Amino acid sequence: MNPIIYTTLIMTVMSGTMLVMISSHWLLIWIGFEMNLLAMIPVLMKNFNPRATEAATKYFLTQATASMMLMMAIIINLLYSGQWTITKMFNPVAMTMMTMALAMKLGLSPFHFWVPEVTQGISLQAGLLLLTWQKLAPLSVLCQISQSINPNLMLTMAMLSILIGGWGGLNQTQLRKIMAYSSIAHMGWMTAVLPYNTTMTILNLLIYITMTLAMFMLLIHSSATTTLSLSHTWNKMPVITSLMMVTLLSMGGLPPLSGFMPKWMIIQEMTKNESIIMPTLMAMTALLNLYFYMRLAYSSSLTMFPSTNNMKMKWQFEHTKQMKLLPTMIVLSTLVLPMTPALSSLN
Amino acid sequence: AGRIASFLKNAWAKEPVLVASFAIGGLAIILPSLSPYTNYAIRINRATPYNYPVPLRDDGNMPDVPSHPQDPQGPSLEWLKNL
Amino acid sequence: PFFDVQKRLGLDLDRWMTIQSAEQPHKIPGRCHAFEKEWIECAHGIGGIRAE
Amino acid sequence: MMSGRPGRVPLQFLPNEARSLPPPKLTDPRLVYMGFLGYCSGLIDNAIRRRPVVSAGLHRQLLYVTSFVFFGYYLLKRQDYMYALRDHDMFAYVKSHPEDFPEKDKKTYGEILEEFHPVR
Amino acid sequence: DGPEKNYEKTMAILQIEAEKAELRLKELEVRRLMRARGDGPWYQYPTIDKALIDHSPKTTPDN
Amino acid sequence: KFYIREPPHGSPDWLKVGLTLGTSVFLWIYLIKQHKEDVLEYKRRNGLE
Amino acid sequence: MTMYIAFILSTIFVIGFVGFSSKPSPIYGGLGLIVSGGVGCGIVLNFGGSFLGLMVFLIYLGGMLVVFGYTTAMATEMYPEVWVSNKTVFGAFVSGLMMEFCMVYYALKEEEVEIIFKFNGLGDWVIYDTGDSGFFSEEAMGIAALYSYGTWLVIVTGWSLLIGVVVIMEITRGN
Amino acid sequence: MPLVYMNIIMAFAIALAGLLMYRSHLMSSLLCLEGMMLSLFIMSTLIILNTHFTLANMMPIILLVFAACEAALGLSLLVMVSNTYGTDYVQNLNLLQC
Secondary structure, eight states: OOOHHOOOOOOHHHHHHHHHOOOHHHHEEEEHHHHHHHHHHHHTTSOOHHHHHHHHHHHHHHHHHHHHHHHHHHHHHHHHHHOOOOOSSSHHHHHHHHHHHHHHHHHHTTTTTTHHHHHOOOOOOOOHHHHHHTTHHHHHHHHHHHGGGOOHHHHHHHHHHHHHHHHHHTTOOOOOHHHHHHHHHHHHHHHHTTTHHHHHHHHHHHHHHHHHHHHHHHHHHHHHOOOHHHHHHHHHHHHHHHHHHHHHHHHHHHHTTTTTHHHHHHHHHEEEEEEEEHHHHHHHHHHHHHHHHHHHHHHIISSSSOOSSGGGGGGGOOOOOOTTTTHHHHHHHTOOOOGGGGGGHHH | OOHHHHHHHHHHSSSSHHHHHHHHHHHHHEEEEEEEOOHHHHHHHHHSSSSOOOOOOSSSSSOOOSSSSTSSSSSSOOOHOOO | OOSSSHHTTOOOOOOOSSSTTSOGGGGGGOOTTTHHHHHHHSSSSOOOHHHH | OOTTTOOOTTTOSGGGGGGGSOOOOTTTTHHHHHHHHHHHHHHHHHHHOOOOOTTTTTHHHHHHHHHHHHHHHHHHHHHHHHHHEEEEEEHHHHOOOOOSOOOOOOOOTTOOOOOOOOOO | HHHHHHHHHHHHHHHHHHHHHHHHHHHHHHHHHHHHHHOOOSSSSOOOOSSSSSOOOSSSOOO | OSSOOOTTTOOOHHHHHHHHHHHHOOOOOOOOHHHHHHHHHHHHHOOOO | OOGGGHHHHHHHHHHHHHHSSSSOOOOEEEEEEHHHHHHHHHHHHTTTTTTHHOOOOHHHHHHHHHHHHHHHTTTTOOSSSOOTTSHHHHHHHHHHHHHHHHHHHHHHSSSSSOSSSSOOOOOOOGOOOOOOOOTHHHHHHHHHHHTTOOOHHHHHHHHHHHHHHHHHHHHHOOO | OOOHHHHHHHHHHHHHHHHHHHOSSSSHHHHHHHHHHHHHHHHHHHHHHHTTTTTGGGGOOOOOOOOHHHHHHHHHHHHHHHHHHHHOTTSTTTTTOO
């Protein structure tokens, strides 16, 4: 991977997303989607291992099918209204079609089996990229079309998203896999409030984003892929594993940490709109997230784990790659609750 | 100075096709801006009436618009005839 | 669009093609130019959930 | 509660008519906390690089506390701005729609017939 | 401090709270009405601009 | 000394600390000048002054 | 009667697609796609899309060429599959034939087929539009407007093709 | 909505079935995927020629140019699983399991 080639892949991915959240013509939205697709496949193949080839192939198939169904919705609402402008749909089945087309790109409904696997395949930096940047475009499209989305569809889809997100992560030790399942749960979390008011899903997107960088940067600052590998890191990096623990507390949403604020906001606006049964389901099922969160915490910091003899010469070497933004990345993802009113800035 | 000329000579010998292509290409972009006839080409393209010149409703005080298709005043393209 | 840079910084980037009553090449009108002119100028500055 | 508001210039942090609102005081308790929010970023930074946490490179701490308090200040004006607008067209909608908000009549407790519940 | 201190402070507390609570209820009502009817500033979803259309004479008439 | 390798941050990186201090000063005086002109603009805008 | 050709052009499109999607030997799916594209070029052509029809002809009969180019390179084996090898492919094929046949039978009887959307069985010749074109083809002039009004489209495409050759380089580089 | 629209929509529906319902082949599946875009290309050209959407006349080729690019990488990915694994038969395609 040529450094300059890697940079030009960075910015074509980012420009593909930018085209999505700045364009108005529907065709341009599709173009940005595949620009990002065509641009992110090579970086996922940076390591060039057969697992990476597997992950890239599954991503390609899923996202290509999803973009083709995206054009199907595109063509249908064009046919029934002759207007490429992105707005409320004028044909119902076109709206549904776009809903599953985007969802397959998000990993919400049973169209979510790709993400845990593809996260397993690629390197952790590619994992950060996949689970942070490749959500902004589909969320932005879903925000722009919130006028006419079948509320039943979006609600049930978010419900499965969070539910299988919680359940799938229980029996996973690979940190990449449990992070993928947690991201699926957060996907359900924001997409549940997507139909009602998009400011709150934007806020939850921001919090999940900052938490995800604050997470992945800690992982590859510890260089761990399995739970046992992270457990061995309780020694070398005690500060890193303590911050590991505090952000793992911010994971579930235990007050007064940052992660509680989006849950609180989403539930409060859901209750404003007579949806009282609905919020209790994610409120209960967040304990499923908190379960393997607590398991990760126990393996990381709360309980000392048996280290290794050779491991001691690691004591002689220091992490040289700075991996900047980590301090503020932690801080914004831990203590921003007294700043909840600032949500009105996004509105 | 000497290095640039020697490199041009070697390119003209080592890969002559490359220098010929690069030259004629480099002309292809810089002549149209320099040439004084591209505006005349724009005049050529605007001259052709693919559609009908739908007339304007006469109400008085448009001396510029000719009253008759044989009238002297109005747009003319004698430059087209001379060209 | 989400972040409409088009009218902020002041240029058309894609709005030329969005609808078919725009300035078509050599004034070739669409099939439903009159109807969509009526519809667009009907619903202008009204609000989608009110203009529908 | 907003992005479809008339006359809403896009990609514009602080609109011109916001200045009519009281700018947040430099000693705003929210602002000073977000200044303290700068300290936590600085203190953690020394901890990550296993530098002396208390006094490693105060130059790094200075920008960490000054940049955070700055971007906090502009955010607070926008925060007050949206809350002002939400309360602004609030009363405009109410005044322009008197029928939808009937003047509920006030009756003292001597006229109501609330029934006391013996809690035994 | 005297009882008048705490008591004078506390009805002000209650007045501020109530002038916030009825505002919250009115905000719920206003937001609902303005999401339903839409005849007001916010909750107005976008539409098509009238400036994009062209009125100059076309190749074929009655279009 | 001690570590035979030269420490990566064993010398005062004068330029970077210089720009950090210069920034912090810039952000500070921009901030307080900003606040002063906002308050003055407010009073002369709503009729206070 | 060659009246119904504008219908049948689509009809042969459908059943050439099913065998193309009947999951046969890869080259036989390619043959299904080839006959489907050849008959769909007529569908666009008789609607006036001469340039677009010949365009898809050219690019697509190169595109299936290249997907062949690896079928004999990275997809063949000792015993290549045959369009009669698997038993299920016949069932898929016949399920391809009877569905649109039943639906068109209904559209010929009731003209109000209720499948998914609303459709009428009264041919396709109606939906054309009376008018003229002067001395310019509308399709050609529209696709020519790409270099005058397609400001963003050509820019973003060309950038994407550059990125495409870059990624094609990188993924197949083989370290 | 005349029978031509039914036919190309129905062709797209069976392309969706054929590609998405995998039988055993990755190459034939992405072949069905690129046939999918052919169906959508024809479909798109239909309304565009029908309604005299003169500008939108350039959308199909645009829609075309990207779509082949997908296949341009798809088959490109196909060789990369093929040289190591041996075939495009997706049932050995199981190494990434947990």
